[PDB]
Design a protein around this nucleic acid. Sequence first.
RNA 1: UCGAAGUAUUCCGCGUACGUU
RNA 2: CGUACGCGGAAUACUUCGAUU
Lengths: 146, 148
Amino acid sequence: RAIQGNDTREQANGERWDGGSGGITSPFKLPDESPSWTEWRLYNDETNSNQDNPLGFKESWGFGKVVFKRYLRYDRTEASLHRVLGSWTGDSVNYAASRFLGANQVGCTYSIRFRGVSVTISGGSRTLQHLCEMAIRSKQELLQLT
Amino acid sequence: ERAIQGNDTREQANGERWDGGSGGITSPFKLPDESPSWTEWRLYNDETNSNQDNPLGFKESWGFGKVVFKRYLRYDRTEASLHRVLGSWTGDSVNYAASRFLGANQVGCTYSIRFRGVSVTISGGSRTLQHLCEMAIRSKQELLQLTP
RNA sequence: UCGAAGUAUUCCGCGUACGUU
RNA sequence: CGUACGCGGAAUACUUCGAUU
């Protein structure tokens, strides 16, 4: 009850809005770099503002009703790819997940949105091992498709 | 419209899983449904008594707005059985079916597949369908090419 | 991009009931 | 596996509103 409580998802939602550390444990190893409204609006320079070359991608990790979110900037380059692929890993997710799972199994989700295409991997807490190994390949592909 | 009963076309698309069909409703899938019966499913869970290994098949769906199609195909993780299930739908079969329920105003399109208690879903506006396909067809490949 | 409200869907988890039409 | 609801979430599409003078 304490775990999975609304008192913890609120902190997981607010965890996004910190520099390199928020009061609780997070699955991500990189900071959120979400753009301000103005920096996004000014993202109507020479193109449409959402379809072809966006400023980044949005990814989410959920363990039950405990959801973490991140916006990372992806310059469509191999160097920037290697940078965003390390936003999370098997150990970071399980470590975080161990802090909100146990007892009765719940629903876990990883979601990623890029170029108007959303990809979501969903399964039970006991399949978290298989979700991660699939979330990494799905993510790697979504970011290398043209 | 859709028309004129907007929900009746959704009603036929769900029945397409069972009938031919039937009908005349164009489907995005090229393979018939292979859903096991209740008994056949009760007994398949008795050889290697378990809950997610081995599975008799997988479940996949295509949604164009509220017009949803669904298939359950048998899959034994052999190369011969992988090439077939990969033929469940091609890029043209989905675009062909998509052209039948999509207009000018963009709607929500989805592809889903559940295998070994793992569900993968590809969602986006109907204007990115061509992109959902390339991303969905191979996302279907990796899900069926893994091990416990 | 952030937040909130609504509408139409999709998906996962848990629980209940009914099943070779 | 199929069907119907219940609960808790996630994702997408569309609409509206708000966002350092």
